[PDB]
Amino acid sequence: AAVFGIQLVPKLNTSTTRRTFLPLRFDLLLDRLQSTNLHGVLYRALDFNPVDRSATVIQTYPPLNAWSPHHAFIENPLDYRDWTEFIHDRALAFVGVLTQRYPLTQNAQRYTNPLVLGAAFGDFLNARSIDIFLDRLFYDPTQDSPITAITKFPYQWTIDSNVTTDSVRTSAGCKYITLYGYDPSRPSTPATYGKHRPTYATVFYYSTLPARSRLLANLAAGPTVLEHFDSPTYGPHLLLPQTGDVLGYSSSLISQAALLMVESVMDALRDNANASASTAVTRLDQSYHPVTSFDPSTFNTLLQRATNLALLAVQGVQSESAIPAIPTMSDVRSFVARLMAEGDPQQWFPYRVDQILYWPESPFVPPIGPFYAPFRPVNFPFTTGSYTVVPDASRPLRLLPQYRNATITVQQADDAYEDTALSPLITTHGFCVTGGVFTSIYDISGDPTAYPPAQLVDAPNDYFDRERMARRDLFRRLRAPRSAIKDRAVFDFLASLVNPTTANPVLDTSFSMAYLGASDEPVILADIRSGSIPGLPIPRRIVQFGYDVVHGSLLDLSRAVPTGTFGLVYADLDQVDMPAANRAAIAMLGTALQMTTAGGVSVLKVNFPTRAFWTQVFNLYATHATTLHLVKPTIVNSSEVFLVFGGRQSNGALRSTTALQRALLSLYARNAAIDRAVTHIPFFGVPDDGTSDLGIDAVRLFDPMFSDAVANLPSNALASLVSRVVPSSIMFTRVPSNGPVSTTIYGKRTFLSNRRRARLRDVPMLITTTLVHQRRFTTPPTFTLFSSEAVPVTTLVAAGYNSFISEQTRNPNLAHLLDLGTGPECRILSLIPPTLQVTMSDSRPCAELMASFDPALTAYVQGDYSTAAFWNGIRCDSATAIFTIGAAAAAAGTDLIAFVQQLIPRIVAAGGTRMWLQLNTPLYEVSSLPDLIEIDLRDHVYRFNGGERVEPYADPVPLQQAIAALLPAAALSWHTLSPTCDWLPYIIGVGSPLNLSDINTAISYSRLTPILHIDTTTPPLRVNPVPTPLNQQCAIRITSLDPAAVLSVQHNGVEVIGGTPGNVISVAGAAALQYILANQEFLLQFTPTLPGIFDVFLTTLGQPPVPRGSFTITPPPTTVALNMPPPRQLDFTDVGNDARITCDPYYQLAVCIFKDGQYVRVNPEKASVVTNAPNRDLHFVLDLADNHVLLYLCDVTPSGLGDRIAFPIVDIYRIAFPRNTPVRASLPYTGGGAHLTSGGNPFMSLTTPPAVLPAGVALAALSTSVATQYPTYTLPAGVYEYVI
Amino acid sequence: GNVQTSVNTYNITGDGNSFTPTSDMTSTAAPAIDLKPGVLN
């Protein structure tokens, strides 16, 4: 429950016993006073500053707390320096006065009288004669402590200790004295409570109860009279606060009378907080109590409100907000603020003037006398128990949402949100992309097919537009920062076009390089000269150019240049309003392809490869160079591609090939994907509205009373909010203002929630227990569209199906769909049109209150589908087993093929037309991922994260025929995460970072686990080769009754073959399509040049395109044979012997060594893949280092090289070095040292150059060393022993 | 039958409870609530 602004945790907890009041003996009082250091023993600096012996306030204990200074001490306060000195003096000098009147030795075993001792000591400090107090400085425990003060003498004159027959009127102590330099201004200084003052109270001690009536009666005019009912300190006192009110705690001056209440009530609360059973406290409660001039009815004055809350604080109730051990003004004020805030004055325990009603069923055990009545309210909501304190959360903690039973009505659960939501919420964007590049090479000179340069995919219209550009730009900045990547990317590739041989060198060691464009000098320059980029030799000299070179002359590549040629003329200038821009580019390339040495390598960078420029380029420079590859390094969303020219020889023939059409086409196909994706993101610096798709919407509540079983606003707003952001995050925080305690509860409202929330018919409640439990302050909210780290390669794949199932389920005729093994909480409800009737099922119970969704539209079945029983009475025309099918085979400990062998037939019986199952079979390759998936071959099984989970798999072919035998008439097809990254509005759409380099990983993780899409509703394909080999003509036959259809097979999310029988444009190879009337099926005579998964599409003139199955041209047989040369005819001389390597032309091989986890391209002079049109050869130069370090021919792809084929050359690794010939001793690698030892004798050292080389040793002509940045000494003849 | 305490005004294992049918009060609730068209309105 909650009393006014304060919230009280359910559990009641109070100390269960009271320590018998013990009066200090006379000796102990003598030691306490005469101790080395009084600090701690008598007084205690509340906030003593380490740096300097300074203390703003000092809270004091017993023989000192009684004392109340005279005016001269208040005005001109002392510093913590002379203060310790003042007391360390007076405390001692006082012991004298008192001990000389009572020799300790004889009377130490006599209890001093708490009261008199106080006044007797306080009066001593003020320097008042202390004669009278001594007379009775002791008293026998039997006679009351306050009675001895009266019995000994009824002396009604000594100021500050008027003893009458029944009462002793003395000025309250000063539990706080303030040393000069104190100010209630700072929020940090400890809450003094006005007691730093001398006369803020007037403790009236009384002898008997009738003695007390006579007191109250007489002081009934005074503002109010607080009195401690629970075991008063030295005997029943009767505190009377002076009329004045303290400054600081509330903007509205709080009366000294009411402040004392807060300060105490704030104890009974903080004390209940940690009071335990095992401990025995003085008082079962510390709360004060008003006995006079107090208005019992109203609840305005801070006092009335506080009082009202103390009658409750005596039950053991504890404040949810932890009350500090040493209340500080900032804190006290944050409590006195919470108290003032409009609320409901607790009503369980009515107020009395002489009795505190305490719950019988409560921890609190009444003292004795007549002050505690065991009143029992009709229905107290609190039960007992305590709470262990938990430290403040360092960051906003996310809260999984678990639902309750009652659900709010959309209408009410809306404004509820809109009454406390942070609408125009300012939010940071952060960075959505942080990864490297997603480079993609394309050989234009490679493809042997001519493709009319007039009809390429010309720049898409929309491209240049306020809306599109705005986004293309926005995405750009949303990338945590670029040439360092791009530039390096192009060189990672350029390193493959390097030919070391004399026959026809290309980028041969020490080649000169021209460079245009710099900001200081390009960061890549340092690396080229360092030979840092593996595979590429160190150029002799680099000549910079451009518009801001700062190290070379400034040239304008548009017009002519006055410089000489270069082996490599890497051009990176920008083109930017389209025709003259084309001229700009066509011109630039013209001069860049001019500055290159004859037989060089020009590397221009076009900004808009328009089919307008692709005619001018293939026309003007149709000769200039030999080869040509497009190297689009996608760092951000732009269409600027890089073109590299082979041999800058005058009589070349760079014809536009189908490669270009495909390359160019893939590029755009992705900008539509990347753009459509970015649409879901708000423009920087714009206040958050409801418009933005990815907008972060929160709900800040103030001291919200989340209650179970009640639709109170605070708990009502919680509903909507979580409903508006389910699949997301939902992070709740609690920052403590010196006023109330705000608690925002944001979440990244995406389009994945709008889809889900729409399907909701009602907004369910959330078990507020977890929230009610917190009670600790976390850090302030953040509101940031994106998280900070790039999602796991696994998610890039998962969010690759949530886009796929989304597009499949979006189909109308689909009707009723079920999900075999949806998550514990239906995650598929977001990926389905709010109208389709789906029925998710899972062994575990559904996480979302299935009741809130319309029964007709959403159904939920428990138990597994692996068991035959479950399938009774569940009929859906389409099933989807994504993310489960793999776990079921493992759970049911069964074979993968055998499993689906029993599931598919059940879906057929279940009445299913369509099927989608995230099966995990290696259709592309049996190759695995190092950290993501291990493919144990002894037993068909996977190891996602090697161990984390193990699930059996099937093979592309066996599983393919097994399912075709199950559903013979059904058409099968494999959909897999397409390189176009069109699924993006699911990663960048939900607000998650990523690595443009991982897209490659996931498109490779998607290949390890495709989604076999079956369709009983159509005839399946017919591939004549079956395990279709790349580069072989195959027969494919789509059986469609109407010849008037358009065949359009598309692979990778890009169409490649389209056209009615007569004409068929094919970029995948020679495709001759012709509808045969007889069989009524278009027989496609197709021969592919690219392996993959082609999804055949046969679309009728009218109506949407319809899929008719999917065949898969499998990559060629990866293997490597080398015509290794014989020991003789093979030399260790400079001219490197070369064994012709036999490998499919398809795979590009590159020599390298396996250093660490990756492959590092060996330097071209040591080894290389010199390729003649007739054959690819392995050129190598024998070095003594060859026996220790071995080389590997590796599959060079845009990805890390050498994954498909990484075979190690074990021959060049064993070639035994003779005694009759010179041999080259190089260095093993960039980080390794060596030394030669002929015949077991330290002959020489490669690591350290011998000041003077040994007889017959010199540097080689080349730098054959694998590292390319090391010398390579040639020895005479002998028996050297390389020792790395 | 473990003690509860306040959730509900009566403990089951509470002090002096008493099962004891009386032909007089046939236990219960409300099953025959009328809702038919004409009768509900």
Ligand SMILES: *C(=O)CCCCCCCCCCCCC
């Ligand atoms: C504790 O739960 C021990 C079991 C005693 C009661 C369990 C239920 C059987 C008696 C029913 C009492 C309420 C109405 C039948």
